[PDB]
Ligand binder design. Structure first.
Ligand code: NH4
Lengths: 118, 141, 149, 140, 118, 118, 118, 140, 140, 141, 117, 149, 118, 145, 145
């Protein structure tokens, strides 16, 4: 599976991006759905962002987990909820109000997927 | 009153009853955890029985299960036969009943578009119950 | 032969087996009641398994359950919803109650498809109500009502 | 995987869990038998869950059940389930075995696999009936 | 039910045909599907037989169990497996190699079936 | 059609095997379904047989009629009933109790069936 | 597969029963459907038989090939046709008229089938 | 009750009514035979109408038809129906018996009962053909 | 006519056309055999196209294929198709024969005719395999 | 992108390829005719592949086939086995492939209401190919 | 909803990326489909890019991600609304025309998770 | 057993047979390539015929076709559409190309119904592309491009 | 279509990011599915990443190809496999073990897609 | 002449007819806007009626609706209001609901035939614009229910 | 967003828009009546649009329609008449038929989803009232066809 975590530059975290990724990967492995080595995550800081139209300082944190298709809705929902809890806990604050944390779970087409080990 | 709703509600009722039995075979800490779980199941039955009109479990409840799963994963080195002790056998039974309830809830989710969080909870519950069963066997032997 | 018949008979069989286990945890009067129930279930299985060719439970058996239900309602005055299994004994009865409900679901399928077993279904519904009451009575007697949070 | 497969595997899992509970109420000989059965059930779940890719139980495992059935038939001559607490547990396991059998039969009808597993579960339910009666007969 | 057991003349058995038929009937009864008196079995020795085309000495043992339809595949398979175990155990040897043992279970049409006791 | 009649060696008949085969063929012809020359019947005496498990002396009589598919259930049932009546009447007695008489009617696949006259 | 060949005692053959079984097995193998060692055939002489009702001397030859289900109708028909050709060629004569030669192909239930090598 | 059941019972009722008309045109021996057949048809309607709860005709009743068929086959060697007024009535009954047979076959296919009754009706139609030909042959 | 009939007849027509091409690459003995086969295919198209009204190939024609198969089996002991140009043509015809077989099987399943023709085509495909291997073996 | 369209287009492609092979076994006049036919098939594939959006063959092209059919009918006295010569065998093959293409196009016509002219062309083509095959055998023997 | 706007480094915009993001959010709000606070957009400059195989080329691509449940009219309108904003924001870039494109995709609502800290 | 499986396997068989014929009309390098392709098809037939139980072609086999496709694209710079079969040799390859496409259609049916054979399908698509190129290269070499009118 | 290639910063490539994109575009064009100018690819270096939970140093390379819907599974699979071959061959090393290379092919909704040339 | 096509075409025809009635109750500016919309609907009917053979409205036409939506949005700042505060605005409220009815018919065509997505987007935006135009008329006359 | 729900909601929206147009041609008394009806329709759209999650109109609202029906009934004593004796009454005849069209859409929702029965009853009574109001206007102006 592939996880992308996106954070606005004005978002303050309790831990480093490195540590957050480690916590995210541990949470994904706890699902029991994935081999350890197959969990690949990355963190991106957003420098050019806008939330809404209001002139209020806002920070947000978003994740997108991509997994190969075939897993049921319970698994997908659990994966999303597990990641959202981890991300929410890592938030220290940012902007002038609350921080929106969201997680999408999407499915990659298994039949056409290609993987190699070099 | 739809059959899939009735079946899902009934099987959740069966789950909390078997948990109600198992909690008399565990220590006080584990009993506390199982009774929190019984409360969560009551909330889930409220939502499913009302076809989503009444609110179900919060995501904080799933996070709570996840916390416990991460905790007990450390004292378990993950194949062994179910029921190493009488006590752990009770939890193995509950785990399989949780999975049965999950199958019924999944049917509801696919037909009515509700109970996705409930299903995630039940899947997480079944994994925790597996771990609790193994932990009991370890703390005994 | 018919899957709904086989499933209903199988689930009834599972119900009387769980009642068979529970009756070793209750007192003599309740044991006597649970054993009468096992006999009623055996009668029900014979009718369902034969698709209504062999007679099932009489209306008097349902009247009997109703008598017990009225008797034990006098003893149970719950203010709230309670968590199942306040004691080990009551937990076994709660398990039996839910299996009775599962049996009821299977028998209902048979009734709607074959037009037989309505009285059996009525019996199972009343049984599940009685089992709820017996569970609570035991918890009252030992002061082990755990109210839902 | 497929719903019938999931349901069959799950119900088999429930069966071995109930057997795992029951084996703490029987003597050492019956305990040994029940644990072999748990190993057989695990083998069956492998075959069913993999839709036949992985091999299931052999004919010899069924032959082993038949030998035990013939043995305990010698000791056993319409009774209510659960004459004793111990026999009640085996009566429960028996009915769960039949419930698993119904689930596996659906897989066999749909996917054409698990016939041997179905036969095993049928024979198992017969053995469990016999074991429950033997316990009661010894305890009068 | 009706059971036919066919054995090539060069097959050696650990017991007599009679004892084998008794074991088969006990195994069939142990299924719980039939009344004792309804199990009818017979043993046939094949005097004119050929297995394959190669100039190899071979022996085989085959059984055909015929039952009235209505039973499910689990029962039909259990009956065949039970009989096959009984037959395989009865084999001492034969020919210059392993002995093929096989059992078929077939169903008789119940609706057209005729039975009487004189 | 092909008719096989199997009788245990301890079965006593009111007529010879030959006469019994003649009666069976006349009954089959009287159905009106077959050409006279197409009715082929044979009688087999079972020398190695066991009925049940109990130490009781028993005799049985079984017939299997094989016809090409295509006929309806009424015809298949009439054929079995006709044969069963002929067989039951032929029974004088056997063993220490009543004699079980049974008749199966089975269908041969017509599409793959091969027939020639030399 | 299992092949049974039944011949009335008054049937004259151009070869021995043994040679006939060899020819049948070679024909069955030539279909390409079976392993050599799996083809099991037997020959039976019918001593008590009646064909029809008329006082005419007749002889017949019948074969029944039993195979595990799964093959299509083309294969089942080819097997029957192959065997029928072998049997018809083997017939020298019999009775006072032409000899009816017939072959059935039947299917054994694969799912319940039991097989072992001792 | 169910439509196929109703149709089968009704057509059987029509059959015995037409036989009841025909028996006034035949001699005393054939009259005795036709009245036995009416009793058999009444037995069949009981079984069919009750969807198998009540027992139908025995194998012996079919055996009785076979005996009569074999008897009259001895006397009978492509002819137009109704060579005489008497034989015409039996030809009518024959075709009604086949119509009842088709109705009962539907019940057998749907409900799995009445196979023996279907066999009886088939044999009956054959007997009625023979009886019609015997009458004509005697009257040249 | 019906679509499955049209498709079966057309594919049979394609088969005999490809055989008609192949027979110009083989020797005189094999050429004689292929032309008999073309006559048999024409007979089959008559039966199939007329939905069974006109008679198709006899059992003897299948018996003729079996005799040739047994003959060339004696000479032939996993190889890539088309070891030589000649054998490549027969390998093509073989696969076309199987394609015709699939089309005829549909007709047999739907209309209950052409079973003998299907058997013939199956045996033909086997013979064509053998003929292709015999050519290669002679040419090393 | 519908399956019947793809199947019809693919089988037309197979037809023009086999004609592409056959044209190396005929004389210059016949080669000219076969190459005109290959062009017609390309036009037909354009129309079918576009679900009728692009125009197909004109009726003049059917008339052209009909002219050739009337012409060659005179030198053929219409039953003989396919492939009298190697050359004519090639045309017999093309004829049966033309009929296969016709079956696929017919399916398109009945489902989408297009390709009727294309189907008429293919039927006419198959008859011409039969005649050309017989003419070759005659002009050789 | 989440909007990602990708621009090749050689693309010249009429305004700053920030201004472009504001226009995009305003257009999205004008659809009437979303709460103002829910609309989240980000801008990315592609520093390593190739278009085709041959030439100086610039392009501009957006991907709008919304929770599922809305019909095709709404999805098409959202895409067309953003495409107009993006197209009007292009001042030039490269030695040819600038390709502007917008994808609208759907996030699975049932499995979606969100919380406010 | 399954008709789509049988049809796909049968059509693959037909493809390698036509390739078997064509390889006697091309030069040694192309013959070597066509024989490698026959082996790949044999591997594909084993997987499809077993419904994905026996392993099929590796991704490296598809990479191999792509390498050849890139190599021969350098040699083919068509300005227009061309008529199939400019030479006898190229005509055989055009026939093979269309049979490969027909095989692809059958395998696609298997993929959509059974969820197996996607890599095989990808291989057949690339194969048909390669066969097109080889046909044109031969026609280039002999100057026999016949442009569509 | 749009191609995104992501490489962990510790991944060693055989060429520059720019040349890798050119090779990827050529492979995509060789599919014959796209006009040359429509193929748009971008390369991203990941600076903050984690693979799995173990302490072992790992590098990975991932691509996501987005195309308008409408093409069959054979085409989608061939595109993925083609890109995977190009990516794998471009890997020189990185980390302390094998490098996982993976390619996803996803479909953009054609009906709602908006495109303009300015 | 497929039923969903005929119904979609018919309802678009009904929409442009009601707009044609409405434009006689609005000021000259809105009348000009409504006539442009009538021309766009004519173009849409050509595309749908031809099952996509004829080109339909462009993205530019949708962008034009959006520009007007943004323009009139800064004049409207509503709670929910009852339709038809004035006779004039009631005519536009009617057109808005007819546009939604047309949108429903077009959606069936898009889902079944894969054409008309842009047209559907246009009709959705149109209904939004007509809402705004209606409120603008009411606000100007001080007649918001 | 189920199609029958969307269609029922859309048609109710069309109804209240036409009523909004009609109320500018009637006297003040009927205008007040029509505006109450617009508010009831708004309430009905909330219930249907939410698949019954939000409470719909009460029995009291139906009883209010009935009271008005009984009131205007004693003024009307018709043979059958052609719709639209006057311009004003024609507007109400239009609303009546739109109400019936809305009723048909709501009936589909009730039969398929088990909600909206009261709403359907309301729309049926409404169509009856609108009939009466139309004839009252015509009788007063002496314009019964
Ligand atoms: N998309």
């Amino acid at each position: 599976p592939h996880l992308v975590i996106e954070a606005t530059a004005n978002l303050r975290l309790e831990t480093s991006p490195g540590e957050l990724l480690e916590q995210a990967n541990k949470a994904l492995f706890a699902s029991g759905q994935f081999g350890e080595a197959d969990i690949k995550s990355r963190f991106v800081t957003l420098e050019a962002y806008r939330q809404g139209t209001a002139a209020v300082e806002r920070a947000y944190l978003h994740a997108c987990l991509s997994i190969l298709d075939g897993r049921d809705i319970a698994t997908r929902t659990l994966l999303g909820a597990s990641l959202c809890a981890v991300l929410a806990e890592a938030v220290a604050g940012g902007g002038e109000e609350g921080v929106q944390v969201s997680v999408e779970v999407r499915e990659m087409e298994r039949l056409s997927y290609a993987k190699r080990v070099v | 009153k739809d059959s899939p709703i009735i079946e899902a509600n009934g099987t959740l009722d069966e789950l909390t009853s078997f948990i109600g039995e198992a909690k008399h075979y565990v220590d006080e800490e584990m009993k506390g955890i199982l009774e929190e779980i019984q409360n969560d199941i009551y909330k889930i039955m409220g939502e499913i029985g009302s076809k989503g009109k009444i609110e179900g479990i919060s995501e904080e409840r799933i996070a709570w299960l996840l916390k416990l799963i991460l905790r007990y994963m450390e004292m378990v080195n993950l194949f062994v036969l179910p029921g190493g002790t009488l006590e752990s056998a009770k939890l193995d039974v509950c785990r399989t009943i949780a999975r049965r309830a999950l199958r019924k809830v999944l049917t509801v989710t696919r037909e009515f578009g509700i109970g996705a969080e409930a299903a995630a909870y039940l899947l997480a519950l079944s994994d925790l119950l597996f771990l609790l069963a193994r932990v009991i066997e370890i703390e005994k032997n």
